[PDB]
Amino acid sequence: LAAILAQAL
C-alpha cells in the first residue's frame, strides 16, 4: 500500500 499511495508524488 505504501508504494501505491506514494504514486501521488
mmCIF file of C-alpha atoms in Angstrom:
data_model
loop_
_atom_site.group_PDB
_atom_site.id
_atom_site.type_symbol
_atom_site.label_atom_id
_atom_site.label_comp_id
_atom_site.label_asym_id
_atom_site.label_seq_id
_atom_site.Cartn_x
_atom_site.Cartn_y
_atom_site.Cartn_z
ATOM 1 C CA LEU A 1 0.000 0.000 0.000
ATOM 2 C CA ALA A 2 2.756 2.453 0.870
ATOM 3 C CA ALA A 3 4.268 2.233 -2.637
ATOM 4 C CA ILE A 4 0.901 2.542 -4.341
ATOM 5 C CA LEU A 5 -0.158 5.643 -2.403
ATOM 6 C CA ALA A 6 3.310 7.076 -2.952
ATOM 7 C CA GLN A 7 2.420 7.405 -6.636
ATOM 8 C CA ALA A 8 0.708 10.669 -5.613
ATOM 9 C CA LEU A 9 4.235 12.103 -5.799
#
